[PDB]
Amino acid sequence: VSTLIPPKVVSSKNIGSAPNAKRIANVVHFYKSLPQGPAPAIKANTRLARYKAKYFDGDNASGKPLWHFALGIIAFGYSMEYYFH
Amino acid sequence: AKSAANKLDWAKVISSLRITGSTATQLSSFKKRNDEARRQLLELQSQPTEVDFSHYR
């Protein structure tokens, strides 16, 4: 009876579609995300900070700390098993 | 004019790929072709609406 007009009705149509739900999701997931590894806090300073940078960081993550623990028992020979039970 | 009227109709068919299921826009284009086709035939078959007092009378 006349010229129908569904070419321009997306101003209220862009709310119910599924991609819009993902659209409003990931845009919030993007703006505050740190750009290039910023704010990594690589300078750890808490009590034994030196340990935090050699083995406690996790780059090595090997049996050295338990080796250090074992050597501590060895150095305590005349303190726990000798001169005492 | 006639070729210009449907020239922009070949624009909406390209616009129709993203908009599928147009109820009446194509019908309106069909209507604007149905009546327009009736126009050219009407004027070509239109004799000068008069009686020839010289010859035909």
Swiss-Prot record, chain A:
This is ATP synthase subunit f, mitochondrial. Keywords: ATP synthesis, CF(0), Hydrogen ion transport, Ion transport, Membrane, Mitochondrion, Mitochondrion inner membrane, Transit peptide, Transport. Belongs to the ATPase F chain family. GO terms for biological process: proton motive force-driven ATP synthesis; proton transmembrane transport. It is found in: Mitochondrion; Mitochondrion inner membrane. It comes from the Eukaryota. The keyword Secreted does not apply. Mitochondrial membrane ATP synthase (F(1)F(0) ATP synthase or Complex V) produces ATP from ADP in the presence of a proton gradient across the membrane which is generated by electron transport complexes of the respiratory chain. F-type ATPases consist of two structural domains, F(1) - containing the extramembraneous catalytic core and F(0) - containing the membrane proton channel, linked together by a central stalk and a peripheral stalk. During catalysis, ATP synthesis in the catalytic domain of F(1) is coupled via a rotary mechanism of the central stalk subunits to proton translocation. The lineage of its organism: Eukaryota, Fungi, Dikarya, Ascomycota, Saccharomycotina. F-type ATPases have 2 components, CF(1) - the catalytic core - and CF(0) - the membrane proton channel. In yeast, the dimeric form of ATP synthase consists of 17 polypeptides: alpha, beta, gamma, delta, epsilon, 4 (B), 5 (OSCP), 6 (A), 8, 9 (C), d, E (Tim11), f, g, h, i/j and k. One of its GO terms (cellular component) is mitochondrial inner membrane. Its main location: mitochondrion. It comes from Saccharomyces cerevisiae (strain ATCC 204508 / S288c) (Baker's yeast). Present with 14600 molecules/cell in log phase SD medium. The gene is ATP17. Disulfide bonds: none annotated. The chain holds residues 7 to 91 of 101 of the full protein.
UniProtKB/Swiss-Prot annotation, chain B:
Mitochondrial membrane ATP synthase (F(1)F(0) ATP synthase or Complex V) produces ATP from ADP in the presence of a proton gradient across the membrane which is generated by electron transport complexes of the respiratory chain. F-type ATPases consist of two structural domains, F(1) - containing the extramembraneous catalytic core, and F(0) - containing the membrane proton channel, linked together by a central stalk and a peripheral stalk. During catalysis, ATP synthesis in the catalytic domain of F(1) is coupled via a rotary mechanism of the central stalk subunits to proton translocation. GO terms for cellular component: mitochondrial inner membrane; mitochondrion; proton-transporting ATP synthase complex. It is found in: Mitochondrion; Mitochondrion inner membrane. F-type ATPases have 2 components, CF(1) - the catalytic core - and CF(0) - the membrane proton channel. In yeast, the dimeric form of ATP synthase consists of 17 polypeptides: alpha, beta, gamma, delta, epsilon, 4 (B), 5 (OSCP), 6 (A), 8, 9 (C), d, E (Tim11), f, g, h, i/j and k. This is ATP synthase subunit d, mitochondrial. It comes from Saccharomyces cerevisiae (strain ATCC 204508 / S288c). Belongs to the ATPase d subunit family. Present with 6820 molecules/cell in log phase SD medium. The lineage of its organism: Eukaryota, Fungi, Dikarya, Ascomycota, Saccharomycotina. GO terms for biological process: proton motive force-driven ATP synthesis. GO terms for molecular function: proton transmembrane transporter activity. Keywords: Acetylation, ATP synthesis, CF(0), Hydrogen ion transport, Ion transport, Membrane, Mitochondrion, Mitochondrion inner membrane, Transport.
